[PDB]
Design brief:
Keywords: Acetylation, Cell cycle, Cell division, Mitosis, Ubl conjugation pathway. By secondary structure, the chain is mainly beta. It has three helices and eleven strands, in the order H-E-E-H-E-E-E-H-E-E-E-E-E-E. The chain binds nickel (II) ion. The site of nickel (II) ion has 2 residues, from loops.
Length: 161
């Protein structure tokens, strides 16, 4: 066992069936720092945990989620599974929000130890409220066991309903 592994979070679907949240990723323009054909954005949005985005470039690997309008965001969900991805499994992630690429501010820094499922990241501001922002940037700063490229199998973003 790996006693200090990151506990798996709740299945986002359970959250959705409560009718209290709305997934709003479809409202954003998504871009990636790098990818491999057939292993990119679509594979982070297809509701399929068997497919994945695989980067092909220098760290940090970035997922940019940009809205046209100021948008209220409450929770970011990322699926990562160490048993399946080994060195492609992120180990250090920075979540940043802001008006644009040049005014981003880190709001959460996550250390992941052999994750096995969904990672829930609250996106609240300095007043504990859901942030309202134009952009979210997810940065993979390092992967497990000297991994150059990363894998993520799904990403969801929820706004309060
Ligand atoms: Ni053990």
């Amino acid at each position: 066992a790996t006693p200090n592994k990151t506990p798996p979070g709740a299945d986002p679907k359970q959250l959705e069936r409560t009718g209290t949240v709305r997934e709003i990723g479809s409202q954003a323009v998504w871009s990636l720092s790098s990818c491999k054909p057939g292993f990119g954005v679509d594979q982070l949005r297809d509701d399929n945990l068997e497919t994945y985005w695989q980067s092909d470039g220098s760290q940090p690997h970035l997922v940019n989620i940009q809205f046209r309008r100021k948008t209220t965001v409450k929770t970011l969900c990322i699926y990562a599974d160490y048993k399946s991805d080994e060195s492609y499994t992120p180990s250090k992630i920075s979540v940043r929000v802001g008006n644009n690429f040049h005014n981003l501010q880190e709001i959460r820094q996550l250390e992941l130890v052999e994750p096995s499922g969904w990672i829930h990241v609250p996106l609240t501001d300095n007043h504990k409220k859901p942030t309202r922002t134009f952009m979210i940037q997810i940065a993979v700063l390092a992967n497990h066991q000297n991994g150059r490229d990363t894998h993520m199998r799904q990403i969801k973003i929820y706004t309060p309903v």
